[PDB]
């Protein structure tokens, strides 16, 4: 890493000028005579005691236990930026009525409900009450700062200068800031894309956490510095409560965490360069409740196609098209499952996208057809920066229309990429997004096949020669807005445009899959993300879990990381350990570098080959479980890879655990994260709860810390007692033959002898489950000694050839007669096998279709 190319709070002018304010009495106050209560909202005017500047506070109560408040100037020289396209729709409004009135304070009921808000005049302060219980306070310490619009003409209040770049400020300083205090809570998570632990540490002896999209080259761990993504969502957890803060602003953000209405045990402070104050408060009272509230606010995760859930193979140095054939034949020759092969920037004709160099790849469409003959997909890179050429018609078409980012003096921003130069289009313009989407047509994109997809990189955007590694802040975008206003929405706009283009190229039928690096709040509706370029170290293997956990805590369920690292090619043991780690993650892809070598599963040593193949088989067998988890995340917003305290919100020990995670509510995963460790300690929570390891089916009671020995072929995974998991036990080349393969059910009985599970089935590559309602949602329930199946959603009709082929029951005695009952048919007898030592029972060949409900009785 090079910390010289990145700003601290001292180098950043607005952070320095805003953190100079010590906590104390606030000059801002509320005038209660100029208060207007309407059915839509509440409006009040605030004043500054010293400089006498009028501001407007607008407060709204939103249903499902939410509220939203905005602060903005009353007479501005020009309007400030309000972030569009992040919220899916206008949230519903809950009527506010004045409950009580006092000379200094006025209290309003939230709705026909228990919540209420108290607003005080001198000093201005907002308090949230759940009946008589305080939830959080606004402007408790008097840290509110609102730099008003100065005269259109002290260091740092005007045109600054970076190491070699001059950043002008034509409109002057417009910094905003606020503080919130949450009494009784000591655990706060969120603000993802920081190479840190799951639990955010206090930032009083160091720099604040930075939300700013940047391309950090060779980043390190355990730092509060910014990274590729930025999601301004904070979640504060308590054994009895759970609250959420959403800071809707697209500018550079610095957030401070402190510990201490003079005793709030956790304080948060937000500081932004520009914009208005737009804050969403989520009042819980549960973690699933705030998850659903944020899902209703900024949408849910888009349902991915089934092939994207498999193993992705990528390598920078895919020189010829025969190299792809060699990789495919190696995959199909050593019996290694694979779904998608990826291409880096080498495929483009000298960085010229939307085309193929004839010498590079002779016939791309024929190669795509050959790959589809083996039922596999190809993915190409498309960057949001293009070459400035007179023959490359993308530049000329974009220039004639005028869809570029303009520089300081009105010219065209032409920061040069390594071949020749490069231009940057203005993705904020909706017309530019429409043109970008229309450019993904089969007629437009040459050599285009339905089995070819696009992944976006360097969508921060990343300028090779500029301030930090990003664009200048004085660039003028569409609508007369500066780049400092719309920096954090560029990646979201690129991701949305690519997703719209890929879904429009098929007539709105097929499901697109767009994988992007930079993002913002609401990007989960357009695809997936990854944790940049990480080097191959054991420390990065340890830190791979908290980053994905933080990403999933804010709706980005489909997290992942590069397998084997990016720099510093790994040792075989570290490679095998990372393969085992990534076999239980939402995204699974191997990446390399030019200076590295060829690390492929077939090129590994023979002893490690079997372990890698077993890990791939375990990943491919759990495909129905992953698909059901992603469907649940798409329909509700609850993350797939969630921490331990989500399922157990009353166990304090789980409050600081990032070594192990939960895949839904059935599988507990604690992968090995050490070099040659003789064993691992796994914490099993639950008051009178059992867990069964996948390998030996040994039953362990909770809560405790089990020290289990491990080897090179050990992946510690436990199934929770009282769950049902579907699996595909036949390995196939890819994930398309398995679409019509039989299902095996694994039942982990609770101590009371009950279990429950769900399954979701579809064709996996279309939108038919929404338009014509063509999907299959099945629910399996084991009660007493009877296992029944039913329809979780009755309006889901789907015809599938899949039949249930085997039943596995864990923790049950041997039966004397196992029968099967169906609709309008005589009951038959099924042969079974029982193992007394491990107490497992196997029911052989039910031979019944999944779409038809049945019942299995055990005597």
């Amino acid at each position: 890493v090079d910390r010289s190319n990145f700003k601290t709070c001292e180098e950043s002018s607005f952070c320095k000028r805003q953190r100079s304010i010590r906590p104390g009495l606030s000059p801002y106050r509320a005038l209660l005579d100029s208060l207007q209560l309407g059915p839509d909202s509440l409006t009040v005017h605030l004043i500054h005691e010293v400089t006498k500047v009028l501001l407007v506070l607008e407060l709204q109560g939103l249903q499902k236990n939410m509220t939203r408040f905005r602060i903005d100037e009353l007479e501005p020289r020009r309007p400030r930026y309000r972030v569009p396209d992040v919220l899916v729709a206008d949230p519903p409004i809950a009527r506010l009525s004045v409950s009580g009135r006092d000379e200094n304070s006025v209290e309003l009921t939230m709705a026909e409900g228990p919540y209420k808000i108290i607003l005080t005049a001198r000093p201005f302060r907002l308090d949230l009450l759940e009946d008589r219980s305080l939830l959080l306070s606004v402007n408790a310490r008097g840290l509110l700062e609102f730099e008003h619009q100065r005269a259109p003409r002290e260091p740092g209040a005007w045109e600054e200068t970076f190491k070699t770049h001059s950043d002008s400020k034509p409109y002057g300083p417009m910094s905003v800031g606020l503080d919130f205090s949450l009494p009784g809570m000591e655990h706060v998570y969120g603000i993802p894309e920081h190479a840190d632990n799951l639990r955010l540490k206090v930032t009083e002896g160091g720099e604040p956490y930075r939300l700013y999209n940047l391309d950090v080259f060779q980043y390190e761990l355990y730092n509060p510095m910014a990274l590729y993504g930025s999601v301004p969502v904070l979640l504060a957890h308590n054994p009895h409560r759970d609250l959420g803060i959403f800071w809707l602003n697209a500018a550079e953000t610095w957030v401070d965490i402190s510990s201490n209405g003079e005793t709030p045990q956790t304080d948060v402070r937000w500081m932004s360069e520009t914009g208005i104050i737009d804050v969403f408060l989520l009042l819980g009272p549960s973690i699933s409740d705030v998850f659903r509230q944020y899902a209703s606010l900024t949408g849910t995760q888009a349902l991915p196609p089934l092939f994207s859930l498999g193993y992705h193979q990528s390598r920078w140095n895919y020189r010829d098209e025969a190299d792809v054939l060699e990789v495919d034949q190696g995959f199909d020759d050593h019996n290694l499952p694979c779904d998608v092969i990826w291409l880096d920037i080498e495929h483009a004709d000298g960085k010229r996208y939307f085309t193929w160099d004839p010498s590079r790849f002779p016939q791309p469409r024929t190669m795509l057809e050959r790959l589809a003959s083996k039922r596999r997909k190809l993915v190409a890179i498309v960057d949001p920066h293009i070459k400035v050429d007179s023959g490359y018609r993308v530049h000329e078409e974009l220039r004639n229309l005028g869809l570029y980012v303009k520089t300081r003096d009105g010219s065209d921003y032409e920061g040069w990429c390594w071949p020749g130069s490069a231009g940057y289009p203005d993705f904020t313009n909706p017309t530019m997004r429409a043109w970008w989407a229309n450019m993904f047509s089969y007629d437009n994109y040459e050599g285009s096949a339905p089995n070819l997809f696009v992944w976006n990189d360097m969508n921060e955007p990343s300028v090779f020669n500029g301030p930090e590694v990003t664009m200048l802040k004085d660039a003028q975008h569409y609508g007369g807005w500066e780049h400092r206003d719309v920096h954090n929405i560029y990646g979201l706009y690129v991701h949305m445009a690519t997703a719209d283009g890929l879904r429009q190229r098929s007539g709105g039928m097929e499901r697109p899959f767009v994988l992007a690096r930079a993002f913002f709040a609401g990007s989960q509706r357009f695809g997936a993300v990854w944790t940049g370029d990480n080097t191959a170290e054991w420390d990065h293997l340890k830190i791979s879990i908290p980053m994905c956990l933080s990403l999933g805590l804010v709706g980005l369920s489909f997290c992942g990381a590069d397998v084997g690292g990016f720099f510093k090619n790994p040792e075989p043991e570290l490679l095998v350990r990372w393969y085992q780690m990534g076999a239980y993650q939402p995204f699974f892809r191997a990446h390399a570098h030019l200076d590295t070598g060829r690390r492929e599963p077939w090129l590994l040593p023979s002893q490690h080959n079997d372990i890698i193949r077993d890990a791939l088989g375990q990943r491919y067998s759990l495909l129905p479980f992953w698909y059901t988890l992603l469907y649940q995340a798409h329909r509700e917003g609850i993350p797939v890879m969630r921490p331990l305290w989500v399922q157990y919100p009353q166990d304090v020990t789980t409050f600081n655990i990032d070594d192990q995670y939960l895949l839904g509510d059935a599988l507990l995963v604690h992968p090995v994260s050490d070099s040659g460790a003789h064993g691992v300690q796994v914490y099993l929570p639950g008051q009178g709860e059992v867990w069964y390891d996948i390998q030996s089916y040994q039953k362990h009671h909770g809560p405790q810390t089990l020290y289990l020995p491990v080897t090179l072929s050990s992946i510690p995974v436990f199934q929770r007692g009282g769950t049902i998991v579907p699996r595909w036990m036949r390995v196939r080349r890819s994930s398309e033959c398995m679409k019509d393969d039989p299902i095996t059910l694994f039942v982990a009985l609770s101590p009371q002898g009950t279990a429950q599970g769900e399954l979701f089935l579809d064709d996996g590559h279309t939108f038919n489950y929404q338009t014509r309602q063509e999907f299959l949602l099945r629910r399996f329930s084991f009660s007493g000694n009877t296992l029944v199946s039913s329809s979780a959603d009755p309006e889901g009709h789907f015809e599938t050839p899949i039949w249930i082929e085997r039943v596995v029951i864990i923790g049950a005695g041997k039966p004397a007669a196992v029968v099967l009952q169906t609709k309008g048919s005589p009951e038959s007898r099924l042969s079974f096998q029982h193992d007394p030592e491990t107490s497992v029972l196997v029911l052989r060949k039910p031979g019944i279709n999944v779409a038809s409900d049945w019942s299995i009785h055990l005597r």
């Binding site: 019996n335 083996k374 039922r375 036949r730 390995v731 196939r732 080349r733 033959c737 039989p742």
Partner: protein, 93 residues
């Protein structure tokens, strides 16, 4: 599918490893009764197994059991997709 004359007519199909015994009705019922996978030679049910494709060309060899009914031709004669539906023609020359 077996390339050997192990009859299921008179005796039930006992075993090849020697551990488990089954009747001949359970052979080729799309369920893997034996751990060796010998009870499903021409079926993809067995995780471990083979499928002796028959052809008149120059490539008599086994294929992995998961190559049966996968929609992709893997042998000379189109015998792996006999139940899949993907029609194939032999290139045995």
């Amino acid at each position: 599918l077996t390339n050997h004359h192990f009859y299921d007519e008179s005796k039930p199909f006992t075993c090849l490893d020697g551990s488990a015994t089954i009747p001949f009705d359970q052979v080729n019922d799309d369920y893997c009764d034996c751990k060796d996978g010998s009870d499903e030679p021409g079926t993809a049910a067995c995780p471990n197994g083979s499928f002796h494709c028959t052809n008149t060309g120059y490539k008599p060899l086994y294929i992995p059991s998961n190559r049966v009914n996968d929609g992709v031709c893997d042998c000379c004669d189109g015998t792996d997709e006999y139940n899949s539906g993907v029609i194939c023609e032999n290139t045995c020359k």
